[PDB]
From a paper:
This study delved into the unknown function of [name] ([name]), a novel protein thought to be involved in chromosome segregation in archaea. The [name] ([name]) gene encodes a 165-residue hypothetical protein of unknown function. [name] has a tertiary structure folding similar to those of the ThDP-binding fold superfamily, but [name] shares only 5–15% sequence identity with those proteins.
During the crystallization trials, we also observed another crystal form under different condition after a couple of months of crystal screening. After further structural determination, we were surprised to find that only monomer structure was present in the asymmetric unit, hereafter referred to as SegCm. The loss of the C-terminal region of SegCm (residues 155–165) may result in an inability to form the AB dimer interface, thereby disrupting dimer formation. The results of mass spectrometry showed two main peaks for the SegCm crystal of 18038.6 Da and 18143.8 Da, which were significantly smaller than the molecular weight peak for [name] (19859.7 Da). This difference in molecular weight corresponds to a peptide of approximately fourteen residues (including six his-tag), implying that residues after Gly159 are degraded during crystallization. Thus, the extreme C-terminal region of [name] is crucial for dimer formation, as its degradation destroys the AB dimer interface, preventing dimer assembly and even further affecting the genesis of multimers.
Residue numbers in the entry: 1 to 155
The structure:
Amino acid sequence: MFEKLYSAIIYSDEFKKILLGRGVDDLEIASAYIAFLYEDLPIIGKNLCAAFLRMGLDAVYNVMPSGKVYSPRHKLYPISRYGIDGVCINCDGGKIILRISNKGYDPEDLLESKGLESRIFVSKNFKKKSMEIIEKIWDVNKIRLIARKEILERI
């Protein structure tokens, strides 16, 4: 059920390393979990992992210099914008605001929440926990190599 989520995280991590020289961060990873739960919710702010979930490899065409994605058709926006509302990733410009906190959801518990509150809190080490799970189940080095090759053919 979750293959698209794991692949979005690996592909976005490899793409960000190619473009900006660093991997995706905790909030960017959390955006893919939110996008996995709410297909119709605009995601505003740190959203690269959500973009690979919604757009696949086509996400590479819509990345801003900041590493955030602009794609109205997929309800992805890099900054607060007139006429859009949704979840603002670690920003105040939204009717739902997502932040990191000590008592925030771990990845698995986030995916089990039934209900969209106005304030979403995710645990610290969100990336670490997501990445530990994926390396446990998949041959991540092999997938990373395929992802890099496929990304570079589009770039």
